[PDB]
């Protein structure tokens with residue numbers, strides 16, 4: 001149940017709530033007050049998903065789907081069968097996510113390490129809350145949120161996108177995609193670099209971080225370094241999600257027309273607004 | 282049809298990949314043990330991978346993993362419950378004993394070398410050409426602990442030569458001796474360097490190095506472990 | 520507030536590093552460029568030296584030719600007017616030859632011929648750059664991981680503008696060189712093949728794209744959390760495990776039940792990213808050649 005070097009780290013302390021009440025492990029899992037909390041929220045949430053399944057008349061995972069209240073209900077409560085279950089489950093999901101993050105904070109305190117991990121996770125929580133809470137409340141109805149279903153939630157993405165024409169034209173959406181793409185590029189490189197140094201040509205000795213920097217300078221004339229690339233990966237990732245939340249928070253609120261039309265501000269600038277020729281003239 | 286064939290065979294490929302990946306990540310820490318250090322009955326579904334050997338550079342030998350795991354040091358801890366899964370309490374001083382957040386690993390008592398075989402980390406005074414090129418120079422600043430008391434003054438910066446980076450600050454104590462402080466655990470301010478993890482009276486306890494011009498991996502671990510441990514154990518003063 | 524180590528507090532500089540030698544032809548390395556205090560707050564301050572061999576110059580020349588060829592056409596569509604160029608920069612587009620010309624190189628310049636020219640340069644610029652990433656690693660005696668990972672990105676690229684077009688029978692199926700136009704092409708491609716959300720390889724691809732962001736967020740955050748124990752020195756931690764590696768592993772073990780090793784996490788990383796374009800290329804290759812409509816296919820699975 002313990003890794004060979006684990007015992008010396010399992011000492012008391014670090015908890016944020018309940019002192020030593022929940023300060024223990026179950027197998028490899030650390031519990032803590034928030035471990036108990038997420039179990040509660042998760043169990044309750046799964047139960048309500050099952051109940052929702054019977055009301056729908058199907059136990060098929062690819063068909064189950066909990067929808068939010070219809071627009072008519074605005075931002076108020078709704079009958080379980082018509083959006084109420086979705087509202088409670090959403091409360092549970094949020095409760096489980098936040099509890100999971102605080103549990104990580106306790107694990108950090110016991111291990112004496114930084115809080116960068118739970119901090120980064122909060123950005124994911126934020127993107128989720130933007131879609132099921134912030135945007136809907138700003139738009140006036142829970143109905144704008146997405147449904148909890150494997151394929152139904154993809155339909156929502158599709159319908160929501162096309163509601164504004166080709167969503168590709170959302171400028172914040174463009175920034176976000178760039179970070180997602182760049183992050184994957186960077187992750188592939190980091191993974192490849194460290195491995196090519198630790199696993200050089202057969203028979204040769206392990207390369208050094210010096211060879212890692214040399215390799216990239218030879219290739220593109222610059223090397224960000226071992227500390228910098230971990231900083232970069234953290235930034236590209238958090239930025240991708242930050243701009244994702246941003247491109248949706250402005251859609252349907254400050255801008256509700258076709259996203260492609262937004263680009264007319266640039267083309268209609270006084271100066272070239274009339275110069276004949278080109279594509280727009 | 283072709284599409285169906287492609288996707289089914291992809292899931293099989295993916296299953297083999299996860300298997301490979303999980304076993305590769307079992308090259309350290311395994312086999313699992315019971316709290317008393319004996320082999321646990323259930324090791325999980327994945328078997329240990331076949332050993333691999335790394336040829337370390339600069340004639341430092343080889344490393345083969347998985348291999349004999351051993352703490353190679355006494356652990357001042359005792360059980361707090363009659364069953365598995367509970368915390369183990371420090372029998373002595375957790376800071377001095379090196380347990381909990383103050384733990385250190387018994388790494389080789391040699392310094393890390395760069396691609397040329399030279400000590401990777403050296404105090405700046407002994408590093409030709411190196412100088413502070415940006416940001417406040419800490420050398421000369423008084424060092425304050427979490428108890429807002431002055432514990433010493435910075436007399437130098439230990440730098441990573443191949444990566445041109447500051448890694449430690451050498452601090453001189455009231456008694457004329459010095460200690461190293463991890464760069465990541467200090468806050469350089471305009472008129473002082475603040476150390477939140479330790480209280481002034483704990484600086485003397487920071488493990489000392491045997492040579493004044495080099496640090497070994499073993500000493501780095503003891504120093505960093507000790508300082509990080511202050512976050513939990515110094516608390517009654519911070 | 521405690522130090523987070525996202526930006527350096529103090530910068531330190533020494534003599535420009537000319538790098539390792541091994542079997543590298545030192546004649547082909549340029550000189551060290553200047554030092555950037557700007558970059559130094561985040562990563563290394565040193566710019567250069569860069570290695571420019573034959574393959575390097577070849578790739579760089581092809582690259583610019585591809586870039587310029589598109590540029591010439593963009594100027595041509597703007598009637599050589601500087602104002603128009605800037606105004607409609609995002610709308611210009613070098614479309615491929617019409618369906619009529621099929622897979623031939625007879626199409627006139629003003630109708631795809633120029634597209635073929637540009638594509639030729641890009642094809643040379645990219646593959647020669649691939650050989651470069653392989654040779655630069657060999658000269659240093661390192662594994663060929665970077666070149667193999669790069670091949671994965673090349674796969675999706677090859678499929679989009681070469682493989683699929685050949686199998687379809689015409690260059691008209693390829694992607695046009697244009698900022699907004701290649702976006703429109705992407706939207707159309709989906710509409711025309713049913714809905715791409717029904718393509719199982721597309722969904723897997725998204726899985727890995729999302730996963731790459733999740734993993735790098737996890738990995739980057741972990742290393743910074745244990746940098747107070749020298750965690751970023753990943754190679755030495757692989758050779759002689761320190762408390763940074765143990766704490767990193769235990770954080771994840773206590774959180775989700777299992778963990779990785781300092782070397783292992785990088786194997787997870789290289790694959791999570793590589794699979795994005797690997798499954799992606801497969802999904803695109805099968806579209807229009809074997810499967811006309813993913814919705815329909817999804818109803819039968821064959």
Ligand code: BCL
Pocket residue numbers: 097124125127128130131156157158160161162166167168173176177180241243244245246247248705706
């Ligand atoms: C046809 C439809 C439109 C379109 C419509 C939309 C719409 C509509 C939306 C996006 C959004 C996104 N689009 Mg789009 N998009 C299109 C085309 C593209 C193309 C392309 C190459 O063509 C690309 C690259 C993208 C890319 C993207 C991403 C930038 C972004 C989603 C990532 C995200 O928010 O993560 C954020 C991550 C999360 C929300 C997850 C949070 C995870 C939570 C906290 C934890 C869950 C735990 C789980 C329950 C636990 C399980 C336990 C088990 C034990 C494992 N789009 C087309 C043109 N796109 C979305 C966005 O920006 O959202 C903010 C969005 O709403």
Ligand code: BCL
Pocket residue numbers: 046049128131146150151153154157721722723725726727729730733
């Ligand atoms: C970000 C913009 C859209 C969106 C757009 C898309 C698009 C577009 C696609 C998906 C796809 C998926 N989405 Mg989504 N998705 C959104 C929000 C969510 C939320 C949430 C809590 O907000 C969740 C749990 C999911 C979950 C999922 C997965 C079922 C599936 C992706 C696997 C994956 O690799 O993910 C990345 C994460 C990992 C690799 C980590 C491991 C996590 C595992 C895979 C989670 C499994 C969850 C399980 C199936 C659900 C358990 C719920 C029970 C109640 C406990 N999405 C928002 C609203 N999603 C893909 C698919 O194939 O769908 C059918 C796909 O193409």
Ligand code: BCL
Pocket residue numbers: 157181184641644645672673675676705706707708709715716720721724725726728795796798799800802803
């Ligand atoms: C309306 C349009 C459709 C759609 C149509 C498509 C289509 C069509 C394609 C994708 C593809 C992808 N889509 Mg989509 N997609 C939609 C909606 C989504 C949503 C969402 C939340 O709604 C998401 C997350 C995604 C996500 C994704 C990615 C997983 C995937 C591309 C991976 C990649 O890295 O490419 C970028 C990486 C490359 C192109 C690699 C090649 C790069 C080359 C080698 C570099 C050249 C460099 C050049 C020479 C140098 C430039 C540098 C200079 C300095 C300038 N799509 C909607 C429903 N999507 C692609 C795929 O693989 O699908 C299976 C694809 O073809």
Ligand SMILES: CC[C@H]1c2cc3[nH]c4c(c3C)C(=O)[C@H](C(=O)OC)c4c3nc(cc4[nH]c(cc(n2)[C@@H]1C)c(C(C)=O)c4C)[C@@H](C)[C@@H]3CCC(=O)OC/C=C(\C)CCC[C@H](C)CCC[C@H](C)CCCC(C)C
Pocket residue numbers: 181182184185188189219220578579582583586644645648652665666668669670671672792793794795796
């Ligand atoms: C797992 C797949 C992911 C991935 C991986 C990946 N990409 C890679 C690699 C890998 C493993 C490399 O090794 C390779 C690399 O070398 O990276 C640093 C690369 C690379 N990925 C690149 C791009 C890229 N990757 C992308 C994506 C991805 N790459 C995926 C997410 C995308 C997207 C999202 O569309 C793009 C645009 C390239 C930057 C680079 C390969 C370089 C190349 O092929 O170059 C040929 C050379 C040219 C085209 C030169 C001309 C450039 C400009 C047009 C001119 C202006 C600049 C010039 C310097 C001016 C000179 C002026 C003179 C007066 C001096």
Ligand SMILES: COC(C)(C)C/C=C/C(C)=C/C=C/C(C)=C/C=C/C(C)=C\C=C\C=C(C)\C=C\C=C(/C)CC/C=C(\C)CCC=C(C)C
Pocket residue numbers: 586587589590591593635638639641642676677678679680681690694695696697698701
């Ligand atoms: C300031 O003005 C000057 C003139 C100096 C320069 C200006 C230049 C400008 C403004 C350039 C703008 C270019 C842009 C915006 C280009 C954008 C391209 C994009 C967005 C995407 C590219 C997609 C292309 C991929 C899919 C292409 C793949 C191509 C291939 C796989 C090669 C296929 C090969 C062919 C057809 C023939 C070669 C033959 C053989 C077998 C050897």
Ligand SMILES: [Cl-]
Pocket residue numbers: 540
């Ligand atoms: Cl030399």
Ligand SMILES: [Fe+3]
Pocket residue numbers: 190194230738742753785
């Ligand atoms: Fe790393």
